[PDB]
């Protein structure tokens, strides 16, 4: 996402009132483009054996691309939600 | 603008088609190409550039009889009405094509080189190296697009693997799969160059009109100029 910031500070509007914008308040500077941020990883709980990652029920940090294109769409993995973690915890302790 | 292209016919036919002139205008109605307008009313004869087009419920090499060789208003090359089986179609006539001649259209890449007789269409793989060709396809079955103007002749320069190197009339080499078809010989109306227009009226008949303001950019035509570098600014135009 493109994140921008006004060059010109907007005067305070008040509590219930809405800020009044003028020609100069439409001038922006790009503070950041999120697409250029370093890639982070997705936490997933595997459901089936997958090469070089894990077997089943093990929390894994996978590249978001892989997680969203192969694992999750194919059901090989599930989101590491608290519910999924709990369910796989009962699965583990029931073995 | 309410411009709908006249090229709306969907089914191939022999009958000349009434073609609407463009005047060099887009569908928007603005001039896109200058110097176009007027000229003799013309009718379009749909040319079948896919020489190897086996008839319906038919296949394999087939022959065709040259019903006639006709002048085409829409081309430099003259065309030939040629009939085979139970169909007729317009093709581009080669230099020595005559009415009553027989033309062979084949898709067979024989192990040996087929005797190249002017007018017949064979896959480029079947031709001897160095044969004059025209109506060349870029891809197998695409249809002839190159070497189509009057008197033009490419040369089958080389054949290696499934690829043939052709010399287009612009003396540029082109790589085409040897399965793509081409017709032997040079295109008809070889004397098209020597024609002398003689008078401005003849060009106006041919639909070319004198047109100015052909650039529409600010200042009109502007030849490219070499922008000097800072060191050379001192000597760009030395006063005498």
């Amino acid at each position: 996402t493109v994140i921008v910031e006004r060059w010109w500070k907007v005067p305070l509007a008040g509590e219930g009132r809405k800020p009044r914008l003028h020609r100069r308040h439409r001038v922006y500077k790009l503070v950041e483009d999120t697409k250029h941020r370093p890639k982070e990883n997705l936490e997933l709980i595997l459901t089936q054996s997958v090469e070089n990652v894990g077997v089943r029920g093990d929390l894994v940090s996978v590249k978001k691309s892989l997680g969203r294109n192969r694992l999750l769409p194919q059901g090989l993995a599930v989101y590491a939600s608290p519910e999924n973690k709990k369910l796989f915890e009962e699965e583990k302790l029931l073995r | 603008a309410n411009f709908v292209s006249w090229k709306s016919r969907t089914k191939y036919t022999i009958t000349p088609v009434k073609m609407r002139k463009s005047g060099g205008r887009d569908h928007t109605g603005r001039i896109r190409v200058h110097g176009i307008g007027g000229g003799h009313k013309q009718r379009y004869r749909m040319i079948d550039f896919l020489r190897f087009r086996p008839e319906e419920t038919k296949s394999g090499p087939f022959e065709e009889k040259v019903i006639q060789v006709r002048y085409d208003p829409c081309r430099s090359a003259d065309i030939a009405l040629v009939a085979g089986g139970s169909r007729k179609r317009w093709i581009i006539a080669t230099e020595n094509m005559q009415a009553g001649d027989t033309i062979l259209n084949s898709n067979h890449i024989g192990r040996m080189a087929v005797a190249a007789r002017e007018g017949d269409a064979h896959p480029l793989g079947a031709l001897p190296v160095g044969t004059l060709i025209n109506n060349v396809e870029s891809e197998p079955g695409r249809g002839a697009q190159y070497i189509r103007a009057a008197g033009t002749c490419g040369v089958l320069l080389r054949k290696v693997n499934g690829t043939a190197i052709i010399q287009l009339p612009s003396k540029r080499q082109m790589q085409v799969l040897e399965t793509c078809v081409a017709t032997v010989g040079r295109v008809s109306n070889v004397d098209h160059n020597k024609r002398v227009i003689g008078k401005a009226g003849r060009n106006r008949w041919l639909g070319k009109r004198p047109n100015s303001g052909r650039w529409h950019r600010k200042g009109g035509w502007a030849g490219r100029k070499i922008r000097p570098l800072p060191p050379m600014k001192s000597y760009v135009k030395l006063p005498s």
Binding site: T1, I3, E5, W7, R26, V27, K29, T34, K64, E83 | -
Partner: protein
């Protein structure tokens, strides 16, 4: 002269009149209430007060949202509140230089999403922000059911929300027929979002769509006065016979 009411209140007045008045109360409240969308294209201030370095005094700070333009194509996709920034910049980022019109557009992707509640795969034009929001929500269905209208900002998204909510409210057996255990599992997973069907019917409907729905609901071919007068005459005759 002067209008009795401010011109900016005319829409609310109209909502209080006619078919828009007969519209269900919950839908009218949903239209009336307006919440600011989550910051997407600007970094919100951490707190309501700040020590400005110039004079070292505690000054109030407000978050003024950047106007976002959403092209109509966005209504057919799921942009996680992301849109076009139609603004201006200073060439070379110095205010003493030229001021230039600048449009920032999101990077749009085509992705396929599977909805558990709908048991359907949708191909949706999407943004990386939307993908991240889906990941944080732990699934497309969770993202749709959690994200409010303002943050979702997609007619397609709101239609998906209405479909999922109606599916939950009806407990529709059409969700994986011949697999009642799986259907119950899905409904239990998304139980927390269930609402009455009378309300799920009006989720995400534009004002015009709601008006059309209400008109269709309350359209009735007039009863012939023959029936009304016969009922009245029979009732009166019954009263006379009793008396």
């Amino acid at each position: 002269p002067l209008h009795k009411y401010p011109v900016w209140l005319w829409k609310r007045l109209q909502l209080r009149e006619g078919i828009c008045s007969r519209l269900p109360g919950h839908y009218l409240r949903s239209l009336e209430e307006e919440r600011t969308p989550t910051p997407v294209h600007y970094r919100p201030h951490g707190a309501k007060f700040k020590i400005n370095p110039k004079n070292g005094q505690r000054e109030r700070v407000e978050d003024v949202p950047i106007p976002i333009y959403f092209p109509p194509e966005s209504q057919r996709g799921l942009w996680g509140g992301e849109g076009w920034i139609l603004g201006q910049i200073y060439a070379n980022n110095d205010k003493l230089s030229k001021r230039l019109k600048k449009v920032w557009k999101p990077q749009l992707f085509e992705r396929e999403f599977y909805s558990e509640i709908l048991d359907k795969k949708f191909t949706v034009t999407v943004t990386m922000r939307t993908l991240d929001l889906i990941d944080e929500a732990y699934g497309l269905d969770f993202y749709i059911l959690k994200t409010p209208k303002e943050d979702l900002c997609s007619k397609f998204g709101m239609d998906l929300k209405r479909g999922m909510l109606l599916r939950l409210a009806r407990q529709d057996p059409q969700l994986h027929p011949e697999d009642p255990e799986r259907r119950a599992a899905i409904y239990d997973k998304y139980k927390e979002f269930a609402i009455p069907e009378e309300e799920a019917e009006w989720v995400g409907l534009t004002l015009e769509e709601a008006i059309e729905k209400q008109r269709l609901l309350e359209e009735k071919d007039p009863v012939p006065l023959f029936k009304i007068y016969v009922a009245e005459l029979i009732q009166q005759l019954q009263q006379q016979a009793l008396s």
